[PDB]
Design a protein around this nucleic acid. Structure first.
Ligand SMILES: [Zn+2]
Lengths: 95, 35, 99, 87, 108, 76, 42, 96, 83, 68
DNA sequence: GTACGCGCTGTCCCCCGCGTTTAAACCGCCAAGGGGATTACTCCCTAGTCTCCAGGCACGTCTCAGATATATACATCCTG
DNA sequence: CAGGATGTATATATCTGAGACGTGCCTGGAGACTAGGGAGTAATCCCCTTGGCGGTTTAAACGCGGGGGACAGCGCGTAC
């Protein structure tokens, strides 16, 4: 018992959207789990400070945007920011 | 004012193999968007 | 009559062999013994999961490997082909580890 | 007789051919003979550092059993994160 | 009635509800905006997609059906822009990249 | 545009090349017209060793220029 | 050192002298006490 | 002349005289000590922050700080400082 | 003589000076290039993030505290200038 | 100063530089080079020389974890 | 046996002063724009209920994953 | 300076069976649906400090040369 969370299912889904026909071993799932669990904090912690400096109290997108501009090196930043911008401005249009 | 001759004498003396980058990974800049 | 290979040629095959596989390189039971040995001095009467020891190993090995590689570059810098403790002690200091 | 068979000189449990294997994986060709003690000490220092904090955590959580998470945290604190053990 | 997933309303796959829970309970700030968890989840999804895709080709080129760590290693270490992001991580069961110095080869 | 490639053996060769051609492509042309492998060649001009990734326009080379090629063996 | 310094046993540096800029002033570091003694008495 | 700032300068100075009752201190060094204190305070705090969340408590206690020290200060300083803090508490307990 | 792309502003004797305080004795002729590039690289890697902070704060002038932060980022803390 | 103002041209134009910050930039940019040269020196010595050559710098950086 | 290690050498290429050319400093003057404080407000995110469905757990298989067995090219290291 | 013999490689066949993939079930947490009140937010104004400037002056940079010593090359013994 004592349920645990994970990201397995979502990983598998995303996998199916690129090589729709390729399996994934067990451990190589646990890895890709831990990896997300890492990057998540490595961004959220940074954004926390970044807000705390200018003495705000809320976290919004804008900083997450900046915070990304700091960690991801170069072209990955160029892409990810476009991705975010897009995949939010849609959502706000249709709640 | 450029010591090309001196650097070429250095090329003749040192004369050792050198290592550098090989491939162009522009695909990470490309298909990544289409991913 | 009996065939004997050129000196140092076996290695050139050893490398291309090992740089491919992925499994461990040290037999467990002595390693586990060693760990349990050191552990006493901090709080004796301990008890371990299995995977914990596996982890400890995994890291140790990855460390030593990465260390040797740079040791090698050092050794080349001085136009040798072997290695010597004086080499390790260089990298282990430039890194800032034993700084 | 219950426990506490304190063993000594297990560092010699690291055979020379073992270290040969590692070095090979590293990519070295010719090897001196003194190294077989250099590494035997280097590795020990490295271990000690981790195992200390490893213990420290459990101790704080006051159990008698060193889980894996513990080691993960330790290895992280020193800037050597390790994937694949339930981060 | 007939509720809808926020992810749908975003058109993604990551559990935006789950994320937005995590931020509140992580002491990351005092109060969380609305748009953030969206933006975050999008970034995560993009990243993991990129890496998985690369690994897929990696393993196929070895002519196998599934994906195992050794692939992931051989996947990251070959793309620098990734490789920097993972300067200090260690993938168990990872091996190394095949490599040999230029000098130690025979004369020809 | 034409260039002059003077070699250490007293031979100065002409190539067909554009300012947008890279030094890797120029070395490929050296291979195709002389059989000299591109991994063995190192071209010199304007007090610098020519970089394969850059083009002729990047070095600001004019027409009728006389470049220097040294045979540098890597490997073996 | 045998009469005033060693007889000045304590965590304080209250040790006395005629003409010191600091006088009857405590200090939590006896090392600095003996240091000031070596400076002054010569 | 408004919008007061803060510092530790007062306390630096106070504890100074308790050691070298004849010594002065420039401004730059004052600022440096200030920054240094700020650094260390944060380090130790942030550490204990995780230490709780691991065991999923919700309040920082002394016991937290105790170990968290043992993970930052190398060796000797740790053994000294823990003694110190242990003492300083005990008194405060009885001495309300 | 005014045409000077500021990278040239790093005079060779200057480099020699730092080299001394390090503790080097003799010096080849080429280093006066390596340094000019290395310094350059190191610089962008910091001025970029400094800029970024200023931007996100909607400001228009590079406060010291920014540069400090950016320096703590790379793993190079710096005492004294505030913080 | 003329240097940094030049490099700052790219990431944005028309910026202003609070004076003191330039001092910090300078200062930190120097303690870097010092420690660098130090290690280059140890490197070169290890090869039984007395003078330092660019390959020393390159090796030093590589081991340090900057170039690769 | 080969890689090392020691010694001999024949350089040419940095150090070391010397004139001389200069850009840095400092000193002063000046303008403004942008940063920093102050005000009125609003609308967005927190809180609280009610609910119902996505997600975790336990099974059960079949596979195709993989394993294993078998068999041929090829790259050394010798000979004339 | 080229062939022959070689142990290595490499492939191809068999099983064989643990364990990725579904598959149901059940439920607690995510979502719809409610007010409220303060964090941000425009809007404001008023320094000020940062560029920007124009003379000295002067030490620091610069170019020259010359020479001497560090080095890269080469050769030879040997012991690990
Ligand atoms: Zn006195």
């Amino acid at each position: 018992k004592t349920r645990k969370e994970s990201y397995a299912i979502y990983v598998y889904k995303v996998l199916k959207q690129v090589h729709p026909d390729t399996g994934i071993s067990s451990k190589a799932m646990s890895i890709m789990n831990s990896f997300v669990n890492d990057v998540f904090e490595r961004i959220a912690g940074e954004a926390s400070r970044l807000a705390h400096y200018n003495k705000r109290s809320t976290i919004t997108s804008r900083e997450i945007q900046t915070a990304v501009r700091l960690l991801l090196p170069g072209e990955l930043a160029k892409h990810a920011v476009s991705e975010g911008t897009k995949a939010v401005t849609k959502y706000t249009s249709a709640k | 004012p450029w010591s090309e001759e001196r650097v070429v004498r250095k090329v003749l003396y040192l004369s050792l193999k050198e290592f550098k980058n090989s491939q162009k990974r522009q695909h990470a800049e490309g298909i990544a968007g289409s991913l | 009559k009996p065939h004997r290979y050129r000196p140092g040629t076996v290695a050139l095959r050893e490398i291309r062999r090992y740089q491919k596989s992925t499994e461990l390189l040290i037999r467990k039971l002595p390693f586990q013994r060693l760990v349990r040995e050191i552990a006493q001095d901090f709080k004796t009467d301990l008890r371990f999961q299995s995977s914990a020891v596996m982890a400890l190993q995994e890291a140790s090995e990855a460390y030593l490997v990465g260390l040797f590689e740079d040791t090698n570059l050092c050794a080349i810098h001085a136009k040798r082909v072997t290695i010597m403790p004086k080499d390790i002690q260089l990298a282990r200091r430039i890194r800032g580890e034993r700084a | 007789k219950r426990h506490r068979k304190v063993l000594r000189d297990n560092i010699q449990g690291i055979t020379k051919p073992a270290i040969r294997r590692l070095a090979r994986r590293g990519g070295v060709k010719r090897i001196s003979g003194l190294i077989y003690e250099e590494t035997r000490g280097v590795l020990k220092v490295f271990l000690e550092n981790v195992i200390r904090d490893a213990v420290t955590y459990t101790e704080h959580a006051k159990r008698k059993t060193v889980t894996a998470m513990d080691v993960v945290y330790a290895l992280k604190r020193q800037g050597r994160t390790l994937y694949g053990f339930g981060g | 009635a007939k509720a809808k997933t926020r992810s749908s309303r975003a058109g993604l796959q990551f559990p935006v509800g789950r994320v937005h829970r995590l931020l509140r309970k992580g002491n990351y700030a005092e109060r969380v905006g609305a748009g953030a968890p969206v933006y975050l989840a999008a970034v995560l999804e993009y990243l993991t997609a990129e890496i998985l895709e690369l690994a897929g080709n990696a393993a196929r080129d070895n002519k196998k059906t599934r994906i195992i760590p050794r692939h992931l290693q051989l996947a990251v270490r070959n793309d620098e822009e990734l490789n920097k992001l993972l300067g200090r991580v260690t993938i168990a069961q990872g091996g190394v990249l095949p490599n040999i110095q230029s000098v130690l080869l025979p004369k020809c | 545009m034409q260039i002059f490639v003077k070699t250490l053996t007293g031979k100065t060769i002409t190539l067909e090349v554009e300012p947008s051609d890279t030094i890797e492509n120029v070395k490929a042309k050296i291979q195709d017209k002389e059989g000299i492998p591109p991994d063995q060649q190192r071209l010199i001009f304007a007090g610098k060793q020519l970089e394969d990734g850059r083009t002729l326009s990047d070095y600001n080379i004019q027409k009728e220029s006389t470049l220097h090629l040294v045979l540098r063996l890597r490997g073996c | 050192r045998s009469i005033h310094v060693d007889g000045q046993r304590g965590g304080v540096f209250v040790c006395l002298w005629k003409g010191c800029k600091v006088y009857n002033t405590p200090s939590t570091s006896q090392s600095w006490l003996q240091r000031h003694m070596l400076t002054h008495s010569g």
